[PDB]
Short mmCIF file of C-alpha atoms in Angstrom, two decimals:
data_model
loop_
_atom_site.label_atom_id
_atom_site.label_comp_id
_atom_site.label_asym_id
_atom_site.label_seq_id
_atom_site.Cartn_x
_atom_site.Cartn_y
_atom_site.Cartn_z
CA UNK A 1 8.84 -143.51 -147.48
CA UNK A 2 8.25 -143.72 -151.23
CA UNK A 3 4.75 -143.86 -152.80
CA UNK A 4 4.78 -147.67 -153.14
CA UNK A 5 5.35 -148.33 -149.43
CA UNK A 6 3.22 -145.35 -148.40
CA UNK A 7 0.30 -146.48 -150.56
CA UNK A 8 0.52 -149.97 -149.06
CA UNK A 9 0.35 -148.53 -145.56
CA UNK A 10 -2.45 -146.16 -146.58
CA UNK A 11 -4.69 -148.99 -147.80
CA UNK A 12 -4.22 -150.73 -144.46
CA UNK A 13 -5.01 -147.58 -142.47
CA UNK A 14 -8.21 -146.84 -144.40
CA UNK A 15 -9.39 -150.45 -144.18
CA UNK A 16 -8.84 -150.52 -140.42
CA UNK A 17 -10.34 -147.05 -140.01
CA UNK A 18 -13.54 -148.35 -141.59
CA UNK A 19 -13.62 -151.26 -139.14
CA UNK A 20 -13.43 -148.81 -136.23
CA UNK A 21 -16.12 -146.51 -137.65
CA UNK A 22 -18.42 -149.51 -138.07
CA UNK A 23 -17.85 -150.69 -134.49
CA UNK A 24 -18.49 -147.22 -133.07
CA UNK A 25 -21.83 -147.02 -134.89
CA UNK A 26 -22.76 -150.66 -134.28
CA UNK A 27 -22.04 -150.64 -130.55
CA UNK A 28 -23.79 -147.28 -130.12
CA UNK A 29 -26.91 -148.75 -131.73
CA UNK A 30 -26.60 -151.71 -129.35
CA UNK A 31 -26.18 -149.40 -126.36
CA UNK A 32 -29.23 -147.28 -127.16
CA UNK A 33 -31.16 -150.52 -127.58
CA UNK A 34 -30.14 -151.54 -124.06
CA UNK A 35 -31.21 -148.15 -122.68
CA UNK A 36 -34.55 -148.42 -124.50
CA UNK A 37 -35.00 -151.90 -123.00
CA UNK A 38 -34.50 -150.61 -119.46
CA UNK A 39 -36.96 -147.77 -120.09
CA UNK A 40 -39.69 -149.87 -121.71
CA UNK A 41 -39.43 -153.15 -119.78
CA UNK A 42 -39.19 -151.52 -116.35
CA UNK A 43 -39.89 -147.79 -116.10
CA UNK A 44 -42.74 -147.64 -118.63
CA UNK A 45 -44.28 -150.81 -117.19
CA UNK A 46 -44.15 -149.42 -113.65
CA UNK A 47 -45.48 -146.07 -114.88
CA UNK A 48 -48.53 -147.64 -116.55
CA UNK A 49 -49.58 -149.37 -113.32
CA UNK A 50 -47.92 -147.80 -110.27
CA UNK A 51 -50.35 -149.40 -107.81
CA UNK A 52 -49.44 -152.93 -108.93
CA UNK A 53 -45.69 -152.37 -108.54
CA UNK A 54 -46.12 -150.78 -105.11
CA UNK A 55 -48.43 -153.63 -104.10
CA UNK A 56 -45.75 -156.11 -105.15
CA UNK A 57 -43.29 -154.32 -102.85
CA UNK A 58 -41.47 -151.96 -105.22
CA UNK A 59 -41.79 -148.41 -103.88
CA UNK A 60 -41.51 -145.12 -105.78
CA UNK A 61 -38.29 -144.38 -103.89
CA UNK A 62 -36.84 -147.81 -104.76
CA UNK A 63 -37.39 -147.13 -108.45
CA UNK A 64 -35.66 -143.74 -108.27
CA UNK A 65 -32.64 -145.29 -106.54
CA UNK A 66 -32.46 -148.38 -108.74
CA UNK A 67 -32.69 -146.68 -112.15
CA UNK A 68 -31.38 -143.21 -111.29
CA UNK A 69 -31.35 -140.84 -114.29
CA UNK A 70 -31.13 -143.60 -116.93
CA UNK A 71 -33.88 -141.91 -118.96
CA UNK A 72 -31.86 -138.69 -119.20
CA UNK A 73 -28.91 -140.76 -120.41
CA UNK A 74 -31.17 -142.30 -123.05
CA UNK A 75 -32.26 -138.88 -124.36
CA UNK A 76 -28.62 -137.81 -124.73
CA UNK A 77 -27.70 -140.95 -126.66
CA UNK A 78 -30.76 -140.78 -128.89
CA UNK A 79 -29.37 -137.41 -130.01
CA UNK A 80 -25.79 -138.68 -130.07
CA UNK A 81 -26.64 -141.74 -132.17
CA UNK A 82 -28.64 -139.61 -134.62
CA UNK A 83 -25.65 -137.29 -134.99
CA UNK A 84 -23.32 -140.24 -135.66
CA UNK A 85 -25.76 -141.73 -138.17
CA UNK A 86 -25.89 -138.42 -140.03
CA UNK A 87 -22.08 -138.29 -140.34
CA UNK A 88 -21.94 -141.92 -141.48
CA UNK A 89 -24.82 -141.75 -143.99
CA UNK A 90 -25.70 -143.82 -146.02
CA UNK A 91 -23.11 -146.26 -144.67
CA UNK A 92 -19.71 -145.68 -143.04
CA UNK A 93 -16.87 -144.74 -145.38
CA UNK A 94 -13.24 -144.13 -144.45
CA UNK A 95 -13.34 -140.40 -145.29
CA UNK A 96 -16.26 -139.70 -142.93
CA UNK A 97 -15.64 -137.40 -139.96
CA UNK A 98 -16.76 -138.15 -136.39
CA UNK A 99 -14.44 -136.01 -134.27
CA UNK A 100 -16.71 -132.96 -134.13
CA UNK A 101 -19.70 -135.02 -132.95
CA UNK A 102 -17.89 -136.11 -129.79
CA UNK A 103 -16.71 -132.54 -129.17
CA UNK A 104 -20.26 -131.24 -129.53
CA UNK A 105 -21.62 -133.76 -127.01
CA UNK A 106 -18.78 -133.55 -124.45
CA UNK A 107 -20.79 -131.37 -122.06
CA UNK A 108 -23.97 -133.41 -122.52
CA UNK A 109 -22.29 -136.47 -120.98
CA UNK A 110 -22.32 -134.79 -117.55
CA UNK A 111 -25.47 -136.86 -116.90
CA UNK A 112 -23.15 -139.80 -116.16
CA UNK A 113 -21.80 -138.14 -113.02
CA UNK A 114 -25.11 -138.63 -111.20
CA UNK A 115 -25.67 -142.16 -112.49
CA UNK A 116 -22.21 -143.49 -111.66
CA UNK A 117 -22.14 -141.83 -108.23
CA UNK A 118 -25.45 -143.55 -107.46
CA UNK A 119 -24.86 -147.02 -108.88
CA UNK A 120 -23.25 -148.57 -105.79
CA UNK A 121 -26.39 -147.67 -103.85
CA UNK A 122 -28.49 -149.03 -106.72
CA UNK A 123 -26.75 -152.42 -106.93
CA UNK A 124 -26.82 -152.87 -103.15
CA UNK A 125 -30.54 -152.10 -103.12
CA UNK A 126 -31.19 -154.62 -105.91
CA UNK A 127 -29.51 -157.34 -103.82
CA UNK A 128 -31.90 -156.55 -100.97
CA UNK A 129 -34.96 -156.19 -103.21
CA UNK A 130 -34.33 -159.65 -104.68
CA UNK A 131 -34.65 -161.12 -101.18
CA UNK A 132 -38.33 -160.16 -101.38
CA UNK A 133 -40.20 -162.92 -103.30
CA UNK A 134 -42.86 -160.69 -104.91
CA UNK A 135 -40.32 -158.07 -106.01
CA UNK A 136 -37.90 -160.71 -107.31
CA UNK A 137 -40.69 -162.25 -109.39
CA UNK A 138 -41.80 -158.84 -110.65
CA UNK A 139 -38.30 -157.94 -111.86
CA UNK A 140 -37.92 -161.31 -113.58
CA UNK A 141 -41.27 -160.69 -115.27
CA UNK A 142 -39.97 -157.36 -116.57
CA UNK A 143 -36.83 -159.05 -117.89
CA UNK A 144 -38.82 -161.73 -119.71
CA UNK A 145 -41.47 -159.46 -121.23
CA UNK A 146 -38.62 -157.13 -122.19
CA UNK A 147 -37.14 -159.95 -124.27
CA UNK A 148 -34.57 -161.48 -121.91
CA UNK A 149 -34.00 -165.24 -121.71
CA UNK A 150 -33.51 -166.99 -118.36
CA UNK A 151 -29.87 -167.60 -119.29
CA UNK A 152 -29.13 -163.96 -120.18
CA UNK A 153 -27.07 -161.58 -118.04
CA UNK A 154 -29.03 -160.47 -114.94
CA UNK A 155 -30.53 -156.99 -114.49
CA UNK A 156 -27.42 -155.73 -112.67
CA UNK A 157 -25.38 -156.32 -115.82
CA UNK A 158 -27.67 -154.02 -117.78
CA UNK A 159 -27.73 -151.39 -115.03
CA UNK A 160 -23.92 -151.42 -115.10
CA UNK A 161 -23.83 -150.92 -118.87
CA UNK A 162 -23.58 -147.10 -118.77
CA UNK A 163 -20.44 -147.33 -116.62
CA UNK A 164 -18.95 -149.81 -119.05
CA UNK A 165 -19.97 -147.84 -122.14
CA UNK A 166 -18.64 -144.40 -121.20
CA UNK A 167 -15.22 -145.96 -120.61
CA UNK A 168 -15.26 -147.57 -124.08
CA UNK A 169 -15.27 -144.25 -125.95
CA UNK A 170 -11.63 -143.45 -125.13
CA UNK A 171 -10.70 -146.96 -126.35
CA UNK A 172 -12.65 -146.58 -129.58
CA UNK A 173 -11.28 -143.09 -130.17
CA UNK A 174 -7.71 -144.19 -129.41
CA UNK A 175 -8.07 -146.76 -132.19
CA UNK A 176 -9.77 -144.25 -134.49
CA UNK A 177 -6.94 -141.75 -133.94
CA UNK A 178 -4.46 -144.51 -134.75
CA UNK A 179 -6.19 -144.94 -138.13
CA UNK A 180 -6.68 -141.22 -138.82
CA UNK A 181 -3.45 -139.91 -140.47
CA UNK A 182 -2.44 -136.24 -140.34
CA UNK A 183 -3.61 -135.75 -143.93
CA UNK A 184 -7.10 -137.05 -143.07
CA UNK A 185 -9.72 -134.27 -142.66
CA UNK A 186 -10.90 -135.81 -139.37
CA UNK A 187 -7.42 -135.78 -137.82
CA UNK A 188 -7.53 -132.65 -135.63
CA UNK A 189 -11.07 -133.31 -134.39
CA UNK A 190 -10.44 -136.97 -133.49
CA UNK A 191 -7.33 -136.04 -131.51
CA UNK A 192 -9.37 -133.44 -129.63
CA UNK A 193 -12.30 -135.85 -129.21
CA UNK A 194 -10.05 -138.46 -127.59
CA UNK A 195 -8.89 -135.99 -124.94
CA UNK A 196 -12.46 -134.73 -124.46
CA UNK A 197 -13.83 -138.20 -123.70
CA UNK A 198 -10.92 -139.05 -121.39
CA UNK A 199 -11.71 -135.84 -119.52
CA UNK A 200 -15.37 -136.91 -119.30
CA UNK A 201 -14.35 -140.24 -117.72
CA UNK A 202 -11.96 -138.51 -115.33
CA UNK A 203 -14.70 -136.04 -114.31
CA UNK A 204 -17.07 -138.93 -113.56
CA UNK A 205 -14.39 -140.76 -111.59
CA UNK A 206 -13.56 -137.72 -109.46
CA UNK A 207 -17.20 -136.80 -108.87
CA UNK A 208 -17.71 -140.30 -107.47
CA UNK A 209 -14.65 -139.89 -105.23
CA UNK A 210 -16.03 -136.60 -103.91
CA UNK A 211 -19.56 -137.93 -103.39
CA UNK A 212 -18.20 -140.93 -101.49
CA UNK A 213 -16.46 -138.61 -99.02
CA UNK A 214 -19.61 -136.58 -98.39
CA UNK A 215 -21.85 -139.64 -98.14
CA UNK A 216 -19.59 -141.24 -95.53
CA UNK A 217 -20.29 -138.28 -93.23
CA UNK A 218 -23.99 -138.03 -94.12
CA UNK A 219 -24.65 -141.73 -93.55
CA UNK A 220 -22.92 -141.70 -90.16
CA UNK A 221 -24.84 -138.63 -88.99
CA UNK A 222 -28.10 -140.19 -90.19
CA UNK A 223 -27.57 -142.93 -87.60
CA UNK A 224 -27.51 -140.31 -84.82
CA UNK A 225 -30.74 -139.21 -83.12
CA UNK A 226 -31.17 -135.73 -81.66
CA UNK A 227 -28.35 -134.06 -83.59
CA UNK A 228 -27.38 -130.55 -82.48
CA UNK A 229 -25.48 -127.88 -84.41
CA UNK A 230 -24.12 -127.76 -87.94
CA UNK A 231 -24.10 -130.86 -90.15
CA UNK A 232 -20.87 -132.86 -90.36
CA UNK A 233 -20.51 -132.05 -94.07
CA UNK A 234 -20.67 -128.34 -93.23
CA UNK A 235 -17.48 -128.35 -91.13
CA UNK A 236 -15.76 -131.76 -91.49
CA UNK A 237 -14.32 -133.84 -94.34
CA UNK A 238 -13.64 -137.24 -92.74
CA UNK A 239 -13.95 -139.48 -89.70
CA UNK A 240 -10.47 -139.94 -88.20
CA UNK A 241 -11.25 -142.34 -85.37
CA UNK A 242 -14.26 -143.93 -83.70
CA UNK A 243 -14.54 -146.14 -80.64
CA UNK A 244 -16.35 -146.93 -77.41
CA UNK A 245 -15.02 -145.40 -74.20
CA UNK A 246 -16.13 -145.00 -70.60
CA UNK A 247 -17.01 -141.40 -69.75
CA UNK A 248 -17.11 -139.77 -66.32
CA UNK A 249 -18.28 -136.24 -65.55
CA UNK A 250 -18.60 -136.00 -61.76
CA UNK A 251 -21.32 -138.65 -61.89
CA UNK A 252 -21.99 -142.21 -63.00
CA UNK A 253 -19.59 -144.06 -65.29
CA UNK A 254 -21.26 -144.10 -68.71
CA UNK A 255 -20.38 -146.01 -71.87
CA UNK A 256 -20.21 -143.68 -74.88
CA UNK A 257 -19.43 -143.90 -78.58
CA UNK A 258 -16.80 -141.31 -79.52
CA UNK A 259 -16.18 -139.94 -83.02
CA UNK A 260 -13.16 -137.79 -83.91
CA UNK A 261 -13.36 -135.85 -87.17
CA UNK A 262 -11.15 -133.11 -88.52
CA UNK A 263 -12.36 -130.05 -86.54
CA UNK A 264 -14.87 -131.93 -84.35
CA UNK A 265 -15.26 -134.45 -81.53
CA UNK A 266 -18.70 -135.99 -81.08
CA UNK A 267 -19.90 -138.39 -78.38
CA UNK A 268 -23.14 -140.36 -78.28
CA UNK A 269 -25.10 -142.98 -76.35
CA UNK A 270 -25.54 -146.25 -78.25
CA UNK A 271 -29.15 -147.39 -78.58
CA UNK A 272 -29.88 -150.90 -77.29
CA UNK A 273 -26.08 -149.36 -85.23
CA UNK A 274 -28.00 -146.31 -83.99
CA UNK A 275 -26.96 -143.58 -81.56
CA UNK A 276 -28.34 -140.75 -79.45
CA UNK A 277 -26.46 -137.45 -79.64
CA UNK A 278 -24.97 -136.35 -76.31
CA UNK A 279 -22.37 -133.71 -77.15
CA UNK A 280 -19.88 -132.13 -79.51
CA UNK A 281 -16.68 -130.10 -79.21
CA UNK A 282 -14.94 -127.98 -81.82
CA UNK A 283 -11.40 -129.36 -81.58
CA UNK A 284 -10.09 -125.79 -81.84
CA UNK A 285 -11.36 -125.28 -78.27
CA UNK A 286 -10.54 -128.79 -77.08
CA UNK A 287 -7.63 -129.66 -74.82
CA UNK A 288 -6.46 -133.03 -73.53
CA UNK A 289 -4.55 -134.00 -70.40
CA UNK A 290 -3.14 -137.35 -69.34
CA UNK A 291 -4.40 -139.11 -66.22
CA UNK A 292 -2.06 -141.40 -64.31
CA UNK A 293 -3.33 -144.91 -63.55
CA UNK A 294 -4.71 -145.43 -60.05
CA UNK A 295 -5.60 -141.79 -59.45
CA UNK A 296 -8.99 -140.17 -58.91
CA UNK A 297 -10.50 -136.71 -58.49
CA UNK A 298 -13.71 -134.67 -58.69
CA UNK A 299 -14.15 -135.19 -62.43
CA UNK A 300 -13.81 -138.97 -62.04
CA UNK A 301 -16.25 -138.75 -59.12
CA UNK A 302 -13.77 -140.55 -56.88
CA UNK A 303 -13.55 -143.52 -59.25
CA UNK A 304 -10.11 -145.01 -59.88
CA UNK A 305 -8.94 -144.06 -63.38
CA UNK A 306 -7.03 -146.53 -65.57
CA UNK A 307 -6.02 -146.09 -69.22
CA UNK A 308 -7.68 -142.70 -68.98
CA UNK A 309 -7.37 -139.04 -69.82
CA UNK A 310 -9.26 -135.76 -69.50
CA UNK A 311 -11.01 -133.75 -72.20
CA UNK A 312 -11.42 -130.00 -71.66
CA UNK A 313 -13.93 -127.84 -73.51
CA UNK A 314 -12.28 -124.44 -73.05
CA UNK A 315 -15.28 -122.60 -74.52
CA UNK A 316 -17.57 -123.96 -71.79
CA UNK A 317 -14.75 -124.59 -69.30
CA UNK A 318 -16.08 -128.11 -68.75
CA UNK A 319 -14.10 -131.30 -68.14
CA UNK A 320 -14.78 -135.01 -68.36
CA UNK A 321 -12.75 -138.19 -68.01
CA UNK A 322 -12.34 -140.84 -70.72
CA UNK A 323 -11.19 -144.40 -70.03
CA UNK A 324 -10.14 -146.94 -72.66
CA UNK A 325 -10.03 -150.72 -72.18
CA UNK A 326 -6.28 -151.04 -72.77
CA UNK A 327 -3.11 -148.95 -72.80
CA UNK A 328 -2.90 -149.51 -76.56
CA UNK A 329 -6.39 -148.08 -77.08
CA UNK A 330 -5.55 -145.05 -74.93
CA UNK A 331 -2.40 -144.43 -76.98
CA UNK A 332 -4.41 -144.74 -80.19
CA UNK A 333 -6.84 -142.04 -79.06
CA UNK A 334 -4.21 -139.58 -77.82
CA UNK A 335 -2.10 -140.12 -80.95
CA UNK A 336 -5.15 -139.35 -83.09
CA UNK A 337 -6.08 -136.24 -81.09
CA UNK A 338 -2.54 -134.86 -81.43
CA UNK A 339 -2.52 -135.72 -85.13
CA UNK A 340 -5.82 -133.91 -85.75
CA UNK A 341 -4.50 -130.77 -84.06
CA UNK A 342 -1.17 -130.90 -85.90
CA UNK A 343 -2.78 -131.23 -89.33
CA UNK A 344 -5.33 -128.52 -88.55
CA UNK A 345 -2.59 -126.12 -87.43
CA UNK A 346 -0.51 -127.01 -90.50
CA UNK A 347 -3.37 -126.15 -92.86
CA UNK A 348 -3.54 -122.83 -91.03
CA UNK A 349 -0.10 -122.05 -92.51
CA UNK B 1 -29.12 -173.88 -112.86
CA UNK B 2 -26.07 -172.42 -111.13
CA UNK B 3 -25.20 -168.91 -112.34
CA UNK B 4 -21.54 -167.88 -112.16
CA UNK B 5 -20.26 -164.31 -112.44
CA UNK B 6 -16.69 -164.17 -113.74
CA UNK B 7 -14.90 -160.81 -113.88
CA UNK B 8 -11.72 -160.28 -115.89
CA UNK B 9 -9.22 -157.71 -114.59
CA UNK B 10 -5.71 -156.59 -115.55
CA UNK B 11 -3.77 -153.97 -117.49
CA UNK B 12 -4.90 -152.63 -120.87
CA UNK B 13 -2.03 -154.42 -122.60
CA UNK B 14 -2.94 -157.98 -121.59
CA UNK B 15 -5.76 -158.43 -124.10
CA UNK B 16 -8.68 -159.10 -121.76
CA UNK B 17 -11.11 -158.36 -124.57
CA UNK B 18 -9.40 -160.62 -127.14
CA UNK B 19 -9.33 -163.40 -124.71
CA UNK B 20 -13.07 -163.13 -124.07
CA UNK B 21 -13.95 -162.75 -127.76
CA UNK B 22 -11.75 -165.71 -128.70
CA UNK B 23 -13.41 -167.90 -126.07
CA UNK B 24 -16.98 -166.98 -127.05
CA UNK B 25 -16.84 -166.67 -130.86
CA UNK B 26 -16.26 -168.97 -133.83
CA UNK B 27 -13.53 -168.43 -136.44
CA UNK B 28 -11.54 -166.06 -134.23
CA UNK B 29 -9.63 -163.85 -135.13
CA UNK B 30 -11.16 -163.13 -138.57
CA UNK B 31 -10.76 -159.71 -140.19
CA UNK B 32 -10.74 -157.43 -137.16
CA UNK B 33 -10.68 -157.87 -133.39
CA UNK B 34 -13.35 -155.65 -131.76
CA UNK B 35 -12.64 -153.17 -128.95
CA UNK B 36 -15.94 -153.96 -127.24
CA UNK B 37 -17.03 -157.13 -125.47
CA UNK B 38 -20.58 -156.95 -124.12
CA UNK B 39 -21.54 -158.78 -120.93
CA UNK B 40 -21.94 -162.39 -122.01
CA UNK B 41 -23.74 -165.44 -120.64
CA UNK B 42 -23.68 -168.99 -121.96
CA UNK B 43 -24.24 -172.50 -120.66
CA UNK B 44 -20.98 -174.41 -120.28
CA UNK B 45 -20.65 -178.11 -119.52
CA UNK B 46 -18.02 -178.85 -116.88
CA UNK B 47 -17.51 -182.29 -115.33
CA UNK B 48 -20.97 -183.44 -116.40
CA UNK B 49 -23.14 -180.62 -115.04
CA UNK B 50 -24.16 -177.50 -117.01
CA UNK B 51 -23.47 -174.03 -115.62
CA UNK B 52 -24.51 -170.55 -116.71
CA UNK B 53 -21.18 -168.72 -117.02
CA UNK B 54 -21.45 -164.93 -117.03
CA UNK B 55 -18.46 -163.02 -118.41
CA UNK B 56 -17.68 -159.40 -117.56
CA UNK B 57 -14.92 -157.39 -119.29
CA UNK B 58 -13.36 -154.35 -117.58
CA UNK B 59 -11.46 -152.87 -120.54
CA UNK B 60 -11.28 -149.08 -120.50
CA UNK B 61 -11.61 -148.68 -116.73
CA UNK B 62 -7.92 -149.18 -115.93
CA UNK B 63 -7.29 -145.48 -115.17
CA UNK B 64 -10.52 -144.83 -113.23
CA UNK B 65 -10.09 -146.24 -109.75
CA UNK B 66 -13.54 -145.33 -108.38
CA UNK B 67 -15.43 -146.78 -111.36
CA UNK B 68 -13.76 -150.21 -111.35
CA UNK B 69 -15.23 -151.47 -108.06
CA UNK B 70 -18.79 -151.13 -109.40
CA UNK B 71 -18.14 -154.40 -111.27
CA UNK B 72 -16.91 -156.38 -108.25
CA UNK B 73 -19.87 -157.07 -105.93
CA UNK B 74 -21.38 -160.58 -106.16
CA UNK B 75 -18.46 -161.85 -108.27
CA UNK B 76 -17.98 -165.62 -107.95
CA UNK B 77 -14.48 -165.83 -109.45
CA UNK B 78 -11.82 -163.40 -110.69
CA UNK B 79 -9.39 -163.78 -113.55
CA UNK B 80 -6.44 -161.53 -112.74
CA UNK B 81 -4.56 -161.28 -116.02
CA UNK B 82 -1.10 -160.19 -117.13
CA UNK B 83 0.71 -160.50 -120.46
CA UNK B 84 3.57 -163.01 -120.48
CA UNK B 85 5.52 -160.55 -122.65
CA UNK B 86 4.87 -157.48 -120.48
CA UNK B 87 6.83 -157.44 -117.19
CA UNK B 88 5.02 -154.21 -116.30
CA UNK B 89 1.62 -155.92 -116.43
CA UNK B 90 3.05 -158.71 -114.28
CA UNK B 91 4.20 -156.31 -111.55
CA UNK B 92 0.77 -154.65 -111.55
CA UNK B 93 -0.74 -157.96 -110.45
CA UNK B 94 1.09 -157.51 -107.15
CA UNK B 95 1.01 -153.71 -106.98
CA UNK B 96 -2.49 -152.93 -108.25
CA UNK B 97 -4.96 -155.68 -109.14
CA UNK B 98 -4.61 -158.21 -106.32
CA UNK B 99 -4.80 -155.60 -103.51
CA UNK B 100 -7.85 -153.97 -105.10
CA UNK B 101 -9.71 -157.23 -105.76
CA UNK B 102 -9.04 -158.53 -102.24
CA UNK B 103 -10.08 -155.26 -100.63
CA UNK B 104 -13.55 -155.46 -102.19
CA UNK B 105 -13.87 -159.26 -102.32
CA UNK B 106 -11.87 -160.82 -99.44
CA UNK B 107 -13.01 -164.44 -99.95
CA UNK B 108 -13.56 -164.68 -103.72
CA UNK B 109 -11.31 -167.18 -105.56
CA UNK B 110 -8.66 -165.82 -107.92
CA UNK B 111 -7.13 -167.46 -110.97
CA UNK B 112 -3.89 -165.89 -112.18
CA UNK B 113 -3.84 -165.92 -115.98
CA UNK B 114 -0.78 -165.32 -118.15
CA UNK B 115 -1.87 -164.26 -121.64
CA UNK B 116 -0.12 -163.95 -125.02
CA UNK B 117 1.61 -167.30 -124.52
CA UNK B 118 2.10 -167.45 -128.30
CA UNK B 119 4.46 -164.46 -128.16
CA UNK B 120 6.75 -165.73 -125.38
CA UNK B 121 8.92 -167.50 -127.98
CA UNK B 122 8.29 -164.91 -130.71
CA UNK B 123 11.66 -163.68 -131.98
CA UNK B 124 10.64 -160.08 -132.71
CA UNK B 125 8.89 -159.80 -129.35
CA UNK B 126 11.95 -161.08 -127.49
CA UNK B 127 14.24 -158.75 -129.45
CA UNK B 128 12.13 -155.68 -128.66
CA UNK B 129 12.02 -156.57 -124.96
CA UNK B 130 15.79 -157.09 -124.99
CA UNK B 131 16.19 -153.53 -126.28
CA UNK B 132 14.66 -152.48 -122.95
CA UNK B 133 16.70 -155.00 -120.95
CA UNK B 134 13.56 -157.07 -120.39
CA UNK B 135 12.54 -160.71 -120.86
CA UNK B 136 9.20 -162.54 -120.99
CA UNK B 137 7.66 -163.91 -117.79
CA UNK B 138 8.58 -167.56 -117.28
CA UNK B 139 6.24 -170.30 -116.04
CA UNK B 140 8.13 -170.61 -112.72
CA UNK B 141 7.84 -166.84 -112.16
CA UNK B 142 4.11 -167.07 -112.80
CA UNK B 143 3.82 -169.88 -110.26
CA UNK B 144 5.65 -167.78 -107.68
CA UNK B 145 3.24 -164.89 -108.24
CA UNK B 146 0.21 -167.17 -107.93
CA UNK B 147 1.55 -168.51 -104.63
CA UNK B 148 2.23 -164.96 -103.44
CA UNK B 149 -1.32 -163.71 -104.07
CA UNK B 150 -3.00 -166.95 -103.01
CA UNK B 151 -4.45 -167.74 -106.43
CA UNK B 152 -6.18 -171.13 -106.57
CA UNK B 153 -4.62 -171.77 -110.00
CA UNK B 154 -1.96 -170.39 -112.34
CA UNK B 155 -2.82 -170.86 -116.02
CA UNK B 156 -1.16 -169.71 -119.24
CA UNK B 157 -3.07 -169.23 -122.50
CA UNK B 158 -3.18 -167.61 -125.93
CA UNK B 159 -6.27 -165.93 -127.36
CA UNK B 160 -4.79 -166.24 -130.85
CA UNK B 161 -3.90 -169.96 -130.87
CA UNK B 162 -6.52 -170.74 -128.20
CA UNK B 163 -3.97 -173.01 -126.51
CA UNK B 164 -4.89 -173.27 -122.84
CA UNK B 165 -7.90 -171.01 -123.38
CA UNK B 166 -10.69 -173.51 -122.65
CA UNK B 167 -8.91 -174.65 -119.48
CA UNK B 168 -8.89 -171.11 -118.04
CA UNK B 169 -12.67 -170.92 -117.97
CA UNK B 170 -13.15 -174.57 -116.99
CA UNK B 171 -10.98 -173.92 -113.94
CA UNK B 172 -12.77 -170.64 -113.23
CA UNK B 173 -15.99 -172.64 -113.02
CA UNK B 174 -14.36 -175.38 -110.98
CA UNK B 175 -13.10 -172.78 -108.55
CA UNK B 176 -16.65 -171.88 -107.60
#
C-alpha cells in the first residue's frame, strides 16, 4: 500500500498497541495486589498468632494445602512487575519493548505447576473447612480485615486467580503481537514471548494431567491397610477394573475386593471405604482358567461354583476360585484380564 | 442473601469476555474492549428479591483441558456460549463444552447462549461465511441444540447492542 493508506493503518496499530501495553501493566498491578492480599490477610495473620488459628480449627497442614506455594508465586511476580514497570517507564508508550521480559521470566513461571496441580485438593478442602463454624468465621474475618466486602467474590475466587492469570498472558501477547508490526523493534521478541507463555501453560496443563494419574494410585493405596511389596506408583500406571467377588481357596467362601492394574492384581478384605491387604499377583505370572457352572473341586472346597473362574499364581503355584454375582460381571472380569495381558505383551514389542 | 456462582464457557471466538464486560460496565464499548475480566460480584434485582450474582470468565483456558475444571465445582448455573456467526463454535457446544460441563456438574442448570446476534444480518459477515460455504446459526437451529443438551433456556444476545443481554443473566438467576 501507498504511504497514505499505510500511515492510516500505522496510527491505528500504535494506538491499539498502547491500549494493550496499558492493560498488561494495569492487570499485572491488580494481580500482584491480589497476591499481596492473600499473603497479608491470611498467611501473615496466621503466622503472627499460630495458636489462635489452630485453636479455631485451622491446622498447619490445612494452611499448606489451602494456600500451596502462593508466596513463591508472589515473589516471582514482584520481580516480573518491576521488570515490566522498568520497560514502561515513566508511562507506557507505543515504542516500548516487553517481549524480552517474558522470555527472561519463562523459566521462573514453573512455580505454577505445583500450585495448579494442588488447587483441586485446596478447593475441596475449603468446602469442608467452611462446614466448621469457627473456621468459617475465621476465614470471613480474614476476608473482611483484608478489605473484602460481604458481597465480594468468595475466597475460592481469589485462590483460583493464579490459574486464571497465567492463561491470560497468551491472550494479551496474542493481541500485542497483532499490534507489533515487523518494523517494530519489539516484533521478534513478542512473537517469541507468545510461544514461550503458551508453552508455560501447556507445561502446567500436562503436569496436572501427570500428577492426577499418580495421585489416583496413591490415594487408592492409602485406603489399604497392611500393604506389602512395592508401591502401586512404582510398577503400575492405572486401575483397570475394581469390584467385589467371592473368593475360595480350599476353605471358607470369603468376600474380597479385587483391583486389576496394568501389571498387578490386588485383593483385599473390606473393613466394616477402607481395606485390609490380603494379596497381590504380578500379572506376568498370573494365569486364568474358566470354571463351568455347577462344578466343584478341591480349590472350591466342594462348593458349587457359578459365574466363576480360577486364578493361578505360577510363581507360587497357588490357585483360588473367584465367583461373580452375574454372568455379565464374570465376562467383564475375564475380558479385562485378557485385555491387560494383550496390552502388556504389545508394549513388549 | 443468596449467592449465585455463574460460569461462562465456550470457544475463544464467541466473545465471553465482551459479553461480561458489556453487562457489568457503563458506556460499553468505549475506546477499547479489554482482554481481561476479573471475577465479578454484584447485587442484581430479579422478580423482587435481590441476589448476589458472581460472574466467572474462562477466557484463555480453551486449549488447557486439565485447567478448565478447576472453575467448575460449586457452580450454580452455566452459560454455554457459541457465536451465531461461527458454525464451528456451535458444533463445539455438542462436541466439547456440554460433555465436559455435565461430566463435572451432572445436575447444574445450563443456559445455551447465542452471541453476536448483531452480526447475523451483517452483510460483510454473511459474505465472508459464504466464501467458506457457511451460514449463520438460525434461531430454530439454536432451539434444537438447546433441546439436545437439555438446556433450561435458549437465549440470543449481542454484547455490542446489548439486545437480549440483560435477559441472559436474569434467566441465569431464575434457573437457580
